[PDB]
Amino acid sequence: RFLKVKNWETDVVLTDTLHLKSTLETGCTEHICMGSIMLPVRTKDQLFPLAKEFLDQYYSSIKRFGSKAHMDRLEEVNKEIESTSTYQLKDTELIYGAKHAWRNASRCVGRIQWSKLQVFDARDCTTAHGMFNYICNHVKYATNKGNLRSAITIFPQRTDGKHDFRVWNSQLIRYAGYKQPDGSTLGDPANVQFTEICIQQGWKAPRGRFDVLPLLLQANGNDPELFQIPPELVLEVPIRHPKFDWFKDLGLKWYGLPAVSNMLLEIGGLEFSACPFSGWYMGTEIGVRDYCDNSRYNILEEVAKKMDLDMRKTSSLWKDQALVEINIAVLYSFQSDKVTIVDHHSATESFIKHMENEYRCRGGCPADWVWIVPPMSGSITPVFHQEMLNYRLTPSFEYQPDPWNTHVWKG
Amino acid sequence: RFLKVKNWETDVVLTDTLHLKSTLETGCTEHICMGSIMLPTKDQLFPLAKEFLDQYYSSIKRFGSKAHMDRLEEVNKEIESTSTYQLKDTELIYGAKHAWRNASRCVGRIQWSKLQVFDARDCTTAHGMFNYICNHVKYATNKGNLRSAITIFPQRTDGKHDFRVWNSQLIRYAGYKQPDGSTLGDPANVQFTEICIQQGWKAPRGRFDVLPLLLQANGNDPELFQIPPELVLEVPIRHPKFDWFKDLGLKWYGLPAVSNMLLEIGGLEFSACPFSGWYMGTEIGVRDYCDNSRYNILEEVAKKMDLDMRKTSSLWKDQALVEINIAVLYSFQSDKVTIVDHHSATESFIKHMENEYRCRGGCPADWVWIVPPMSGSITPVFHQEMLNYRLTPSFEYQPDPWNTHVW
Ligand code: HEM
Ligand code: HEM
Ligand SMILES: Cc1cc(N)nc(CCc2cncc(C3CCN(C)CC3)c2)c1
Ligand SMILES: Cc1cc(N)nc(CCc2cncc(C3CCN(C)CC3)c2)c1
């Protein structure tokens, strides 16, 4: 079966066959599209076909499909599954698997980079202290004094679901949020709940606007433990504007390393519940969402006041004008400090070439338009005009419930 | 089966039950989402009529009444005898308003119940269509104080006598491919312009030539008519700060009027049903002016602003974009021509969505189309989960008549 996508700007038409290999469900039906919905213990029974599907893909990729090495490996995994109810991946398979989960991530505009991922195998880790050390090393490697390098650290896979490894932080580096008795918020309002957990767990909060949160780390299903990332490993960038000298006095900064730590990595049916991964920022993530969402730092008003825009009616587009200047400032600041960042024009242009390359060589590139299009200037980027097909391939990154809602406290 | 949508900015959760009444298919499956794809008999007819009449009679609190039953009775007999049926004026008006109410890609639906419906089912000739369209244009324009309207021509019979407006919109600018290899005017309209010329249009070969109407009545060959120039309200574009902006020579038309869609009501198909409201600024300033395949003016504007266009990361494109959109809104407002900015429009839509969930159990919405083409996440619709599904009455796409027409 063949599906066509068209780019309405260029009239380029692509043909997808890769979607034939999709296994997971989308959330949509013939009667309803859930394309804008944010969020729409395995028996041996279900496990071997998942292992087999993965190993077949791995051996095809190395041009050894149907080799004795392939057949022996299937054999070895089958016996390991029937004996132990699970199986261990070889380092090569783990690396291939992590790269492909990223390659398959339909919400990621950065995927041109997918084959360049440093994989840190942390499957020998046993304690929260061990997790802390692994994560410090990931932060140091990935940051690389501002010359950012993509990396993932993979902690032991799920067993019975009662011994999960989890990073309780949604991201490795994030700022605390504090709810004031008057209802105002200090810091990042998005992180108020997690900040409260940390305080409850014994974190001494400085109560400032940009306090780096401690790591809350869970090993082997035990209660999580608090650790402070060494401040010297946390690279930050003071935000200033190239023309507006008052912009520095807004007191803004941000961290250099975007590192998602709350997702689950599925490879060959195995589940890696703790798998922090990082790349580098696209400017709009900070300049549009982190700074300008009403529910985040929400600085649009203050900035517009300082530019002396007409703020009496929305039709002066004061919000849009200020948004642009803020995003110029983010990019300017990171570039000036030689910290890797990419603008939304470059990134979406690179994505289009990646997507086209994927169609030619892979038969498709699953992509979620709602996430791929940047949160400002959408139609002056080429992804806006690109039809996309969203489907789910494995290996994959998946959402999982927040650990505080599901954890059984040992005490 | 009962679906929740969440607003991630406000934490407000709405519960959708309205989707369970949807009939038409989405293009999506359990295995693939096609949310970003632009274009994904007596026995057929009577259940469609019944479903429609049931919802009509429910709407006026007369469900299960004798008048309900009598009407249902009358329609069924008419279908058995004549193979089709005729809508009562009340039903036609109800259906048209609900087609708009159901348009999942329309951000302006808070206005849905305030629609002026012109019944042109008595029309028989292309000259008649022209008169009805001129009257629509003049009524809807109202000297700049725009009023939403639809004009509805006779319904499809055997499919061989279709009424069609060949134009995709009532008011649009011609496009001409030059020897220079460049494109003059609106590049999106080169093909249709060629058809106009082939049909005898004497083209002015300018950059903002209002296309003539190509009107098809009763399945006959389309005829050419020029909308009276004094009925096409246009706005010269200037900027409140940049004096040089007027020198770009830009203008646009005040009346957004879609003429290529098919209105389905009660299984009946109205293949000619031009409708109009008023513009949201970004339609002109972002898409019409800044799409690379349209008037594509970003570079010229950025140069006049003397921006550093060496690096993408200067965001010169984004800066020029905002100023272009400031000029559009300022120009329409200064000339007192109705227009809405994307902040006001999306704020209105959130209020509408909440009304619809509260009073109807849902509101079908296509996020890909609802979120404005600039400044997406600083508008509230960006943070609003939406469910997209197809309800009738509806506006549907239909094939362009020049690939259909047996001349
Ligand atoms: C190397 C440069 C990268 C860039 C420029 C980039 C860009 C982005 C952006 C802008 C988003 C949307 C994030 C948001 O809106 O919250 C995203 C999401 C995502 N990225 Fe990438 N990314 C990069 C690297 C990576 C890497 C190394 C991985 C994994 C190995 C990855 C996997 C994902 C996944 C799974 C999502 C969806 C996250 C979610 O649903 O919350 N990305 N990326
Ligand atoms: C009165 C103010 C109105 C506003 C502000 C408004 C706004 C919009 C906008 C911005 C779009 C997207 C158009 C595009 O991107 O090409 C749209 C689409 C649409 N509108 Fe509305 N509209 C209004 C009136 C109406 C009326 C009166 C009707 C019908 C009676 C209508 C039915 C539709 C339909 C069917 C679409 C989708 C068209 C397509 O798929 O090409 N709108 N509207
Ligand atoms: C690997 C990767 C690369 C990249 N450019 N961005 C990301 C997301 C980064 C990120 C960092 N801190 C916090 C977040 C939050 C912001 C608020 N969003 C609603 C959820 C993600 C996201 C990940
Ligand atoms: C009723 C209505 C209201 C409104 N604000 N916009 C519309 C869309 C109007 C419209 C007018 N001229 C041209 C177009 C084209 C622009 C290019 N698009 C690809 C197709 C639609 C659309 C319709």
Ligand SMILES: C[C@H](O)[C@H](O)[C@H]1CNc2nc(N)[nH]c(=O)c2N1
């Ligand atoms: C409701 C909607 O799905 C939600 O606001 C989405 C839209 N697109 C997004 N796109 C990105 N990259 N990141 C996001 O968090 C979101 N949020």
Ligand SMILES: C[C@H](O)[C@H](O)[C@H]1CNc2nc(N)[nH]c(=O)c2N1
């Ligand atoms: C491919 C994609 O669906 C296409 O570019 C869409 C995106 N969203 C849109 N939204 C509106 N309102 N109008 C459009 O023409 C489009 N085009």
Ligand SMILES: [Zn+2]
């Ligand atoms: Zn879908």
